[PDB]
């Protein structure tokens, strides 16, 4: 089996000689814990419910229902509500249910017990059991009468079931609803880049890792890591997302003062030659030489690492995210011109980047990097090797974007960042090998 | 270390392409800082750079191992706005072509956001950093101010027949020939400015033909650059084969 | 007093219509239990004759069978009983049922086009984006130039490029953008041609209530071309809007025509600042936003504009709402989008013809107003609901029994059940100011009705009925929902005629004459605009004018670009 | 001489309006320079008509409408001369403004005719009647069924009394025909109802359709245009099923609503139903019978040129490109998925000025002569590389040799679309292989980018760069045979310049060789002159409507509104 | 799959692609296909994967190993990993060349990804696709 060394977010060697199979989503205990943990987790905005009710702003998108205002002291009673929600969400006292108040009782984290996701088709019980528990707990705590109970329910659940989602509600996850999947295996890929940067507290390496874990777990669920793809996927995942052999962080540090996108291209070619991944093939009369590879999976994985290096040094230089679209395009276009070998994902990172550049600089759709995700029609096309760079780029913003994680992701970021393995996934994955 | 080879080909077009990629380009003219700022249209010439957020020295940045090792550009450290320069280059042998303006950006400048289109090529950077890039492209052989223009909007012209005076049409008339030199008295989005910038004599047709990165059948035909065609075919073949089975 | 339907029943059953002999041979007193069945066939009715003649001409011209009344089952054509007319409620407009099918009535089509082609789009986030990213200064002057350019460009005209194709203005004269704002300075300083002036369009109490909800925020009321909404679908509306909003910001603020800030303006227009009429619905009935299935009852009630013109007659507000909503939900949506063919005109006409539901709802409101001391004053309790629903239901049942003409007009039990439940639910909601109480009354009415007559509606009418009482105050995932937020995709409501427009009227009844809106002040204000082709303040008048082929505000035709 | 000689002379060496192109701005079609007279919009009578209409609207309604002076900088269009278009293969000359889907009734009707159509089997319904009720189905019972169905389908009553009905004057475009592989049934059903496969298709094509369909029988249903415009594509099969169900009740003396009627409903709405396409995902949510769900094979099979002129397979491909590019780029991408001024000129290269036609005829001649005729080239990397490279070099050199063609196709996206249609179409025609054609399309793009140092708009080559590697991928959301790709294939789901082009490549793999590309039921459904839009000659319909002379528009409300 | 390929009935709903027919002896080789699919679907040799030929080799039952559903959002890996394993196994067993491999893939997967489901394909569950859920929690309720 291919073996790699695992390094921390700052280039400290954590584990030596790790079989790449042991970082697979299908074997690594920390990936299992992170993925199943995310499936089980919901964020409750207690302050939000209290404000929705006080202002009868039921259902969002500008709505107000005159005459239906209700004053409930929810945040002041957060301890009683936390207790009741814990008892309602649990299956058996002493099981793996977690309910905790955050930020002065303005929010709850809820992690439903594992059995509610194991004996279930997908992840949505984290939203529905939380919303039902919160609604029941509020009705009981505040002695709400029958004729007012629907007002409580719609404050919590929003417009559901008129809408498919909880529009204007106060229970949320970083994952979107399964009906919004573009195809099979896309649920874990439907996490907004801003949510990931907020979860990881804007540590670019950890943001890239969390995103890469979700993207690559998604590629497995899509059926795209079977047979002649498995090793290929694990190489690119480990090298781009898990800082295998310190290629990402070590090169970023070496290039961090003067390097450009082109410096990153050249460093990748240089390292591939030194490591015997590629070698000179056909010399043309001008002196230009094409290169050949003895290991497509490994060359591709070096290109995946280099695409992230280029993101970190170019977005890091701007202290802004928008250039990530250009980085993914030009790193790969230029490395193909330099070598006559295919770039990362055989053109699919470059292609995703072409459309992502357009849809982040035009009238037609998209937005800033923070709104994209692996399920977005624009950025889906790479098999997991584009969006981790997008999420890292978001982490590096010093304040350029309007639709930042502070604007789009406060509730879910506050809740999900409280979970150590979500916030620090590199440490978790290496700790499991 | 590693010596880059950049791009195949032995034609003048390929050699010019490698010059643009490597920033090995001849300075042809002087444009003052204030004249450039006037043409860009983002602030008064000579004025302080506006900020979109406070300087990094006034901001508590998140703990991040990447921020610790990647130096902000001067414009990032200062909190400058993201602003841009945009160029249109005639298909009648302008020195530049869109992708090669973008490669010049990506290879030679830190912190770039280039975009390539047929009729326009753009780069967004923190404003003071953008001006350094804009100046380099504007003063060197990469820009012929007859066959090219600075155009942030209303770009039509790259594929149109040249005017009888040899200059590429501009719907908004931002720059034109006056007395044998190109002059410009509008900013890049067509707003009149209170100065007239002298951008030098345009290149002759013969000099453009020698300096161009564009393949054109009666000058340097793409068909004649056998190395570049072979390269394209090779990358296509490998992308195709590895998409079926990712194995050498 | 005589019942409100006395005149309409005399027109229908004691006056000639066409050559149906109801002015003489078949004349009846409106209380008569018996009549004559003269078997005159379709030829008694000039409208049917026109249709038959057109059908025969089509068959001959195209060489393929078309309409022929002789192709009725058994070869026995319609008109075995006499063919009788309808009066638009509250009016003296008399017409055939055939003049009220959505296919045949251009005002009905335009009502839907005007909803489908409309969205509301904030300005505040867009202006914040310009200020922060570019350092631009936004002023009334920059906004006025933006709105001039936007009204040129929104129908499909060019702003930035050259040698461009454009839509032809002659085809898109119904497309425009107005603004409204809670910022009183901005309301005064924007050019009045663009402004929906809240103080001018609403009584002072309603204006105050709208301004309190909207704060100082500013909004665009966008109406894309009818010819486009007909070629495309509801999900095309916000996309069309956003393209032209984006182009106009580029020009009005001297931006790069395509920079990162433009992308954040795109996300603003298409997502963060956008208020659509409704969102997508599930796969079995798959549609995107701005289709009728996604339209909440609160939004539909807020689109109707009667309450700002005549709040002193809240029953009339409720009835006009029932008319506009029932037409859309039953005729176009359930009888069109979700089925088709002959469809559901007559399931819907009780909401806007012959003054029968009007009689019952005025009766229930008078009962409840006198008993509880005025609109809005009755406590929202089981006892209140039980009382108003039971007495209003008994009144309606006894009316159908006393007046055989009304029973024969509302010949389907579904029609009768809808009519009586609109009255019971509407009277309860008006008395309590409470949409949930009104729904509870609607269901009790149905249950009483079933026992009284030993029948209710069509085979599948009371699916929602029988789930109804228990789901009014349920908090279950897919059952709990405040009334104003229910709509045509609330699970129990997703299939059947006779209910969606009625519930919309019950939601309106909880607010009519008391509040400026039911659920969304942005939707309410958007439609407070006489330039909108369909008159949302008086839908009955528009339906009736178009039934006479005299309504002249149809948009979207291709006449300009085809031969005479 | 190149095929575009005449069209370039019309556009650049003859007056149009008062643009002076017959005199001071006249050019030879090879001239590299011209004059920029800055006449403004008044040089163009169509623009003047638009401006005068806009000013009248502003005044009548009291709210600003169209005004050319509201262009950016207050500099109006027409700084360069405003020049016309010739519909390819014709002498019809018009303005671009006559070709916007909003302004061209034939374009709208093309889409309405697709949207309002479905195909519905008869065999399962007849089996239901036979098994559940013991009914005997004969040509006589079928003929009565079809008579009643054609009365009822537009919205007329069969069973009840005192009923409201749709007005026949508004729904004369709605009808139902049948087609069948059962030759005896084809002859015994009343001819008014039959799409006769033998009459409509040359013998070889008829044989191939009949082999595919066997002895099965089908209804070609077209619901009213006024309805499809009021509603949406998902309304079509629902409308059909209501009236099919009513007609079975009457024609077979059923209870008017029994369990067997419910099994007939499931038959019409699900088991026996062939829609044009299915729903698409939430971000672009639409139900069935919308353009995003339309596969390229279905679009190619809707077009009817191959049954009329299979001896000119290049023309078949070009007409397919025309109908498909209009729908996918103008109405779908430029309408449904965006809007505003939209994408007329991204699409017009498929059907104006004879330029793509020149390049595709050239590539086909190259490949036919070299490999020994259409369909005879082996489907290999070497074949693809050869045809794509030589065709691309021809097209690039044509733009370079004829500045008029470069100026017409002024956007790189247009040029890339044109050349890749030629390269992909020539390859598909040579090999009979859609996948080979797609591989050629992408190689063409890659060569084009390096030749000119530019390709299309900012986001044009997303699918391009994913393209080569995804042609022969077997991944979940990448593997797909060409005929079954469509406007929802992931890489293709956003951008102009490709969907109609791929449709033409799919058609090229079958033109002159097979009667259909993917669905004989769709193919046969549209082989019907009563359908308002002429799917055999889309270019002619576009052009006649550009002149405001096309007379087959359905769905207007004129009958029920004042003049 | 064998019939779909032999008749080029790719995508269902009346479709036929002329010229793309392929004759593969799939059912006769079911035991070899079972073994290959078992190796492709499993994560570790000996895990809880099940692959069994049924009814004369006309069908397989596949039960993907539990980890493919545990470390996943939904259930759909049972469909996708099976479809991928079958596609790869057929390409290998019958030495299918690159230009024909999309034909095999579309015979197995149907019209996916043009459609959201595997319309006309040959891999199915009793559960329908999650995008068809009427609301939260309805996936296990969508069994005919
Ligand atoms: C504002 C954008 C950015 C964006 O998101 N879309 C724009 C504008 C948008 C508008 C322009 C309408 C107007 O003039 O007001 C519309 C029509 C879409 C709409 N909103 O209805 C459009 N482009 Ni654009 N757009 C086009 C094109 C192009 C070409 C034009 C190059 C030239 O030399 O003029 C370039 C891309 C490129 O360089 O490859 C281009 C860019 C751009 N395109 C730049 C503006 C360019 C400029 O400043 O002049 N388009 C084309 O290449 C041809 C088709 C043409 C489209 C109209 C039609 O198809 O009828 C139009 C398609
Ligand atoms: C991407 C997504 O938008 P969203 O990010 O807002 O969901 C999606 N929109 C689209 O895919 C739009 C497609 C059609 C418009 C763009 C076609 S490419 S042609 C424009 C090029 S140029 O002329 O501007 O240069 C939607 O569902 O509305
Ligand atoms: K429509």
Author numbering:
A (entry chain E): 2 to 434
B (entry chain F): 2 to 249
C (entry chain A): 2 to 565
D (entry chain D): 3 to 565
E (entry chain B): 50 to 193
Sentences from the paper on this structure:
Here, we obtained the true atomic resolution structure of their methane-capturing system (Methyl-Coenzyme M Reductase, MCR), circumventing the isolation barrier by exploiting microbial enrichments of freshwater nitrate-reducing ANME-2d grown in bioreactors, and marine ANME-2c in syntrophy with bacterial partners. Methane capture, the first reaction in AOM, has been proposed to be carried out by the Methyl-Coenzyme M Reductase (MCR). In the proposed mechanism, the heterodisulfide, made of Coenzyme M (HS-CoM) and Coenzyme B (CoB-SH), would react with methane to generate methyl-S-CoM and free CoB-SH through a radical mechanism catalysed by the Ni-containing tetrapyrrole cofactor F43019,20. Despite their physiological differences, these ANMEs have extremely conserved MCR structures, similar to homologs from methanogenic Methanosarcinales, rather than the phylogenetically distant MCR of ANME-1 isolated from Black Sea mats.
X-ray crystal structures were solved for MCR from ANME-2dO and ANME-2dV, and models were refined to a final resolution of 0.98 Å. The subatomic resolution of both ANME-2d structures enables the visualisation of the majority of hydrogen atoms and accurately depicts the position of each ligand atom. However, MCR from ANME-2dV exhibits a mixture of ligands. The fit to the electron density was optimal when the model included CoM-SH, CoB-SH, the heterodisulfide, and methyl-CoM. The methyl-CoM, modelled for the first time in an experimental structure, fits a position proposed in a recent molecular dynamics simulation model by Polêto and colleagues with a S–Ni distance of 3.9 Å36. However, due to its low occupancy and the requirement for experimental validation to confirm its existence, we omitted the methyl-CoM from the final deposited model. In both ANME-2d, a canonical glutamine (position α341 in ANME-2c), proposed to be important to anchor the F430, and juxtaposed to the tyrosine coordinating the CoM thiol (position α342 in ANME-2c), is substituted by a methionine (positions α343 and α347 in ANME-2dO and ANME-2dV, respectively). The substitution does not impact the F430 position and provokes few steric displacements in the vicinity. The three studied enzymes have seven post-translational modifications, among them was a novel 3(S)-methylhistidine on the γ-chain of both ANME-2d MCRs. The location of the 3(S)-methylhistidine interacting directly with F430 suggests a compensation for the lack of the methylglutamine in ANME-2dO and ANME-2dV placed in a close proximity.
